[model samples]
Target chain A: KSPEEEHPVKAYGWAVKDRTTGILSPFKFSRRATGDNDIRIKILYCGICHTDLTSVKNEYEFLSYPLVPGMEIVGIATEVGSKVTKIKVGEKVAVAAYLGTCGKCYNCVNDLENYCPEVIIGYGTPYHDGTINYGGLSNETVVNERFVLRFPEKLSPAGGAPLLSAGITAYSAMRNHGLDKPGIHLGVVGLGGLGHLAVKFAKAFGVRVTVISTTPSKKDEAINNLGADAFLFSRDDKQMRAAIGTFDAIIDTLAVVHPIAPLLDLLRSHGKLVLVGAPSKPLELPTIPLLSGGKSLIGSAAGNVKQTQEMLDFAAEHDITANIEVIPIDYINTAMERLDKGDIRFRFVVDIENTLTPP
Target chain B: SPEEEHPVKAYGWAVKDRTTGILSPFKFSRRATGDNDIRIKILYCGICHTDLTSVKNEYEFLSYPLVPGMEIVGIATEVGSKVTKIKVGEKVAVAAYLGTCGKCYNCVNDLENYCPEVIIGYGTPYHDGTINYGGLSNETVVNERFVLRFPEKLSPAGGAPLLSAGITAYSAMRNHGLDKPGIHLGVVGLGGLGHLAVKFAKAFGVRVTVISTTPSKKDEAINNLGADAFLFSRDDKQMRAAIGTFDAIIDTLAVVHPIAPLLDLLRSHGKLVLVGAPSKPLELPTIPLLSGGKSLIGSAAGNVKQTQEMLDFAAEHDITANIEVIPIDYINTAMERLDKGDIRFRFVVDIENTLTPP
Candidate 1:
């Protein structure tokens, strides 16, 4: 059934009612009825991504009021359309960055629908059915059958919330830059959400992982717990220089503005440096290093659906989930403040089932 | 035959008493023969007009005259104790440059041209704190391994530029994967590199199109260079119409210019290879490269092995540099004419014939 079949279903969510000087508060928005291929999931655990803060504040000015920002959504499928039979109604489900894309386009046919320019994102972007498709921060999210993903039974839904956004980003970058190979070395720039998962995934692929970080304390956490083969402090020039031309490719998860020349110098001839993290400004992009050794610098965003399924399956097999500080929906503001200062061990996942109640 | 044993005394024309000015009669000393060195008696030389810029100190760092050439054609007067590739009386030539460490990973991969420790053949500082004067002279000595054997059927004068102009085009084409047959090649600015690129690409059975800023070069690019099609780069309609026409672009313009039009000419996954390094940074737009999976890479001249293969291939195909041979006395006026792009293709110097009195 379409939007005409079911009238307004007023759902409750935590949204920024004010975009000028925003603050999160309980708000009510309406979504369409369950269509023939739709599945309604009871939002259980929503990961607090840095992008959530960006959405509430309207940092890039692409958002308006009543924005419910949680794309890293892990939940239990409570209801489904009669036509959908692949997933059971009570099974665990997850939703990531995208909500819909034109399945007829070339990119969608190639299994890279996430990179489709016209693809509708989870929050802020308008869906084809004339609804402001909200994310998984609220009581529930109704999505098409193709948009819902089955969760592995063994992995905790709260701990694995980040695997939707952060995990797939790292997974796509590694595969795109040819870092998912055995015996090849990989240098991960940060030890945050994406960086630690990159180590886990790369290690399971038999890759030799080197955690290149700025903080010295991550040295122990990266090696002692994360199973990284090596560690190099970005602050130490001697160590950084010694490891020059050591990696085939570098996954720079650092979102802040920093000189990429040093990282470009650390790759061998024909090496690649991929920018999955968008800095505030464009890179200076000095010519000598990019031209001298035939190296390349490319920008990438989220992974495709195929790679996302591959990443979640790989994570489940390896017993990998992000180390998280699980918080109730009441504590979202504090979590956002901490996320702003990079003050988390890894990630923050919201326990929506326990704390979130209809207004 | 070593430095202590008379050292193969060399003589050449030089300049002094002026900056960004003339070259006249002066004398200079060259390093003696080493165990790997071979001495050459000058016969012909190639005048790439970039040599004029160096001779005039216009590029900010220079010594006088540069012995005036790098596309050197000479005869092997003698060989060192360990030299065996070419014997006495063998015709040979030295390219514009040959000072790579030969011990780095680049040399191990035979890509010595990209080695970190690179030295120009002209007046840049050598290891012994002496200057390396180039080929517009009576005699010059270099490592025998650095010198290439000239073919018998070719005239030494026209054969000179197969080292500098010829190899640079070959290197750029090969680097960008444009050496394959049935490919569409875009040659920008048909002078030193473009003409040679057309010849090489056509030799490999590739269809070539010449793109230049001047409409005057259109006929020469097609008739002279044998390009399959010609497009005036300044024409908005033509450039707009031929969008995505090329498989690759070999940009040989030595000066800075807008690269947007050149990028628009390439197909998706196509390459834009820059052999000429601009003095300033190019304004590279990110969207063009990212959207199509395209690349913009730069390259210098070819390495020793590639250069050798290019020379042999050119000789076998009866392909030589299109040049108007000039004597040493007329070099000053030739430099001015070259600055105006007045020559048909290139200017080769008759060093052995004209420099006897000087």
Candidate 2:
């Protein structure tokens, strides 16, 4: 039941053929010819997101074997159909977590397409053309022009790849939760991929960024290299008690079951504690601080089409990009293992053009 | 051995013992009228339910014979050497505040109630090393800045109660940004604060739905208080029919209850503000507030500026509390009935006609 029997064009990507093997085997598949509004990209770079690990091992219920699991992707548009205008050939564009949306839904109409009910995930969801919407790990990626983004000249392909997922997730939370205000104090929790970009973006928006992490060793890099105004270790109770009511807003990027109560105490009256991270089980939520001082806690999904574009435009002007470790496709398994231990600085970008060889 | 031994003598009633719940004549003393003080003849005072708790010594800080009426309506009978705005005779009122750190950021911003060092009007110590007796007294002196002017057209017998219940509900309304017109409001627990919340929110032109465990309050809420709708929180089918219909919910339940269902009723970006913080902490839902951009906030009694504005607004609209006026001696009976939810809406004590001066 090879999909090549039904579709014509042959495509190549790396996939996990077995569960315990943990190896990305060669995947041979066929893609439909470009539609009237399709643009085919020569995949150049793909960021190794945490979700890629989940999809590769088939840990998520929706995932199956022989999967190409990359959601943060940037590549050059090699082909465009008759009606494609958003992306032209020779231009560079990127694709993030979601590839398709129901345009008539309430969220879509209101410009929050990421939360739309009929959205097709770029990794595991079945697309409208009756094929599984493979992620950006392939040699060639074909997407409708609506979901394709035209990168700015200053945005390097490898540096901007993670912006499609990690950057947009952070940017959307900051933007939607009213954290885009200027000259106010902003706090970033979990100085990982999302948290690092949250600081950069908030600083670009003229906010005084404070890196609130658990490790004190990263203080120098957070303050001097990242241009954060302050750095604090979350375990310092004396410092935390002294820093009560300091921040106007705190964006928590920790994807674990840590307490957010102390973080709420850091906010001033009418301040916000926004969550963009996904902790598996619901954490025990304390509401006293939320009640007093009129504080609030909100969660936001990734950016919408319009918001993602606005994020790209902002990044271009500010010259903001991720601090990434670039690697070839053969080293992705090791990258995933290192990412599991939180060993990397922030992100990992794969040089796809040098690795995905033709049969 | 008594507070009465001071310069300004005051005649008031007190409990005299714990849980005996009997009020008797107690001669109290007032601080010497300062340049910024004004003396008020206690005419009417509202009986708040916390007075019951103070009588029973529920809070560890209570002294014997505690007087628990902060909602005071009176006439300015005497002014200090430098009193300017208030005259020797003027209609005036006061609410839950007795004193506060007036130099704090909250006080300067006109939000003195949230200031940590705030002074309660009853069951709390005063600066003069005496228990601050509240509105059951014949004569009292307070800082002129704390005196609130009342409306001429409103009935003095019932208008004083609004100072406590009215402004608390109003402040919770305005502070939470819940005063937006045409937005739906859900009121949980239909008693003193909740009933008053319905009245204030309805007047703001928001469609209000009363959510109660008791079905009997449903018709009363919609027909009597002009609530746009009603829902029984205990009834699953009825509650499900109205999911995500509210723009905000004003939770004023004194009793402990889960708040998850109410949070579910709010649409995205809606707010749920708790004015009546229960005796125990409530189980809060995170996903509702987080996923939908909703908020669950809390507000206590208002600041002086906002309370005066609330009174003015209520007067302009001819809004008065639905009240039953009782003699000061009937305070025990009122307390009993209040615990049983037996009153119409609120109980205001007629201290002017019924209280005898010693």
Candidate 3:
């Protein structure tokens, strides 16, 4: 059955039907009738993630036609399924990069649903019921109650959208790697969406933060405005060399492939370097520096549902939000191109409620 | 000043230059006993893969005219007046490291082997500006703090490797939590360190599997080394079936090899620890590490306190490296055999009986 005929409820969203064109237009689809454990959210804002751009281009090899391009979703609860008591009507909620998982899997039971082998990504992946998920690009998203998180009431819906993906990823990486401790120094590579949030969360954990980037211009903004303690221009040879063996841990957030040897050298003995970004190509690993000092290189993904909720509560206490630029739904393609060029300050959030008009 | 600083004379095999790792008899001297030093009559010294690499200057960190031995076992011949715990005629052993900066955090915290200024057993200058000789010599002097009292239950020849290879495997398992009784451990590369790791894991009552590229070592791994199972890493069928089966894998590969398959064999959040520092780089597939939240960590040699603890544990468990004992004259030939991976487990030079000065 076609997506529109898969269920009873009608839905409309911006989607890219043709991979060759990489263009998204008004798409008409249908969502399944809300199940007993589901909550239907009226999406207020949707953050344009790098994954969305990859999905539109069919880069991840999981995209189907008319793929909706959003995962970081913030919305108001418009309806609740019969068994849904955790969330109610007219409350703000958010959906992370995951929608549903095989609950019986080891990772799910262990509070690590994001690493579940059978996890259904919020967009570009089919649900367990064999129906396509249109994601939050459109006006609505119906999620399983187990996967929904309550967005902090006081945080801006636009700024909070990226937290569902970017925030959880940064927060979980630090927390799991033991990099979120007080007085330990943390280096965040790449000053984009994930990097900025990592800086914020690390500071909130009482960790000393250093922003490492190829661009020297981000130094002042990173240290002065973002509450980072220092900024090291990664391209500067003398600067990087002098800063070696200083950091206790570093989180590399560059989605593009880059040298990791220099980053490994910057760690103290027993230090860890955690990679959150999934570069399509594998990074070079020099074992000498890693073995000589007994260092570790680890990889982490976004947080599980419980961790995501915990991060939201902590962010509420810290008054943290992503620095965002709100754009209309039509400007998403332009935003993707700009994001591809690394042109955004941090993240580009689409005003889905007002701007997502079905033609 | 090269040989005049010490009153005692010594003789051992030395690698003259990087051109050849071959050892020949060379006359050398041991430093006079410091206030805290003890002189040992070298009985036996285990030939480690590190000695082979360092003699060839593979890592390019070795000084020439080097006496290459670190896994040393001997009897204390004389103790300085200030030597507190060690006594004359007591059996003792010394490992790869002998000296370190006493004030560093690693030293103060009992991680002396990881000190930034750590000095090894040989081919490095000691604190007093004299080049330290190793246990290939008949007699040598060292600080008492770096000496370990050899356990009585272990034999000198078989127990020599417990100083380096034994401590390395033991520490990686203990540090990575693979020593737990119910956990599954995969020992990669069935050599000195790998064999010892299997023995220790078995001793800890953990399930052990030996993962190797060689098909022929399967019988020995299971029947001889007490591994519960054997995995031929090259067998796609075996590799596929064993995916996500290991709680931790201790890789003792001395050469560059693909670790992607090992990473795949690990359960979620499993640890892959490297004990041998392959001189070159290993290709790391980041996706596996990221997808499962697994870790790839490196461990250097064990610390001083851990060495003593491991010795006690090994003695309690009757754990020692299976060895092929050789005369001091067979050092060069044994190294050649070791390069081709011909040895059973370890090669220990009988310094007391075989190391006669020409």
Candidate 4:
């Protein structure tokens, strides 16, 4: 298509219209025409993350009307721009949680555009052209080439969508905190979407994995299914006492306000406790435990594009995919409710290809 | 002469109880200089904020009738027969901790101060079952390994703060990898530890920016301390403008304050090292901390080896704390003034010249 030959692509997706209710419904919208470096993806699957649940209710307070809140996306590249050299029309691609970066900033130049100060988030965030972005809950979406990754054929598309958010978050936390080394003892708190992925990655790295959680029911799943060497109930004082000063590092995936003093106690001298989850309220940090032991509390977000690709490749090579429950796009509202109640096993993926019918 | 041949009675000031932190003369006995002990005559001891808190039983584990002084500088009057590091009458300094379990992992690895059985100076038990007293006294006995040789060129009064405050700042910066040049460091709270951090960062060739809540410290921080710039933390406009402009921050605020502002001032992967512990927990907003990959780390007092290294480095760089010298009788009022933040920087007691036994 020449310049002015293509029209705007019509799109339809579930959107939240009210801040109080956060109830999503079928909403029709339009996406900008694919630019010289953009790709139009026929969205096949979109995974639900905790962030999506909070954002729909405007918990983070940066949402606009008709906010489409899916970020972990898997789709087919139905159209590639003229300047897109890496992707083709028939290839499978992904859009994680970002759309655009300034390209001239320090983080962007250093290949860490995910942390760019002026980053344009996947949904409801403004683009440089003053357009709002619709996330991958839609049937089709347009994203820049830099933010797109080639989806591996071996991994399940539905299961792999969660990797863009949860998978990369775990992988980046481990890699950044030096928890990726072999034979080191690693503790994964909260055996949910992010924690499960952290367990798999730490196991694959030859590190000893321990799942620490409050749910005693997940013990068997943590040890038998996830191959965790040990499981410690966070509520059991006896068990927690025995594991004191045992962990080299702990990846805390808990997204709620909880006491982290116990987590800090489990770390050995000079240990690190990395936070991959962001709670709304502040965490209570007792300094004596951290100060006396020379321990560190590190905060990390999701991985950048390069690290995301590395995580994807690593996941593919290791045959790792998120344990997911696929649902129809119509079930997204219920999925958000279940996710909020901690009812989902790990992740919920919407089968947009089969369920997203034009309204 | 051997230790037992010289029987000595030491006299110093001690807080009678937690209710009244008034100092009065207290006579104490000094154990015979053991094979590894060095008996020093106290000359100058700096008054640290911790001394105020400990004397008033503010910190847990402090027994009543405590002698509180950690920044100790003295002369070696007697060296035990087995003492190998220092000779008689050599200038030396003692750190906050007097002893530790030598077999622990921390002690064997030169982190003796962090040992689980660390023997804090003044009111903790020593190895011989006697109470370990601090250096705000006439004479004291300490293991040779726990003592540092004060440099001859360094001022005894000015270098006293280096034993505690200097090493607290230096160890935090060195351990966090913020000692290298070409990095911008933010020093918060222009107090005892803060001023020294600025000097140390400048000595390492790192640019220093002093962040303070008081506006009057702007000139002192920039003009007197040679800081490259000064930022009043109370000004939101200045704070908003300096977001993500520092490689690391040395926080010396001993009181509770929000750490989110300091965290926002750091660049990606920057470290905010805490050298002071507040009475309560600080409000930590994890969103900013994790989004920028920042770290909240805590540092205790320096170990013996690094404290020695810091002392040597301070001598090499001509670094010393700006101090106000005071007599022993004036210490009670000085503590009151220090509690009110009235001193210029540090107050070192002239223990040798002013101490007179009742």
Q: Clash pairs of candidate 1?
A: none
Residue B8 lDDT (model 2): 79
Q: What is the lDDT of residue B333 in candidate 4?
A: 96
Q: Which runs of model 4 end up more than 4 angstroms from their true locations?
A: A1-7, B1-8
Q: CA lDDT of each candidate? A: 0.77, 0.79, 0.87, 0.87
- In model 3 chain A, which range of ten residues has the least summed lDDT? A54-63
TM-score (C-alpha, index-matched) for candidate 4: 0.96
Model 4: pairs clashing at backbone N, Cα or C within 3 Å: A299-B290
**lDDT, candidate 2, at A322:** 95
Better of 2 and 4 by DockQ: 4
Candidate 3 runs further than 4 Å off:
B1-7
How do all models score by TM-score?
0.80, 0.85, 0.97, 0.96
Give lDDT: candidate 1, residue A35.
Answer: 89
Candidate 3 per-residue lDDT over residues A1-359, each given as its tens digit: 77678789988988898888889999988888788999999999999887887776668776777788889999998999888898989999998788888888788888888888677888776789877777888988788999899988878888888999889999998888788779898899999899999999988899998899998888877988798998888778998889988999999998888988899889988999998898888766787777768899888989899999998989888889999999999998999899888898889999998998866
Local error of candidate 2 at residue B235 (angstroms)? 4.0
Instruction: Please provide, for model 4 over A295-328, each residue's C-alpha lDDT reduced to its tens digit, 9 standing for 90 to 100.
Output: 8989988889999988888888899988899999
Top candidate when judged by DockQ against the true structure: 4
DockQ of each: 0.25, 0.32, 0.73, 0.77
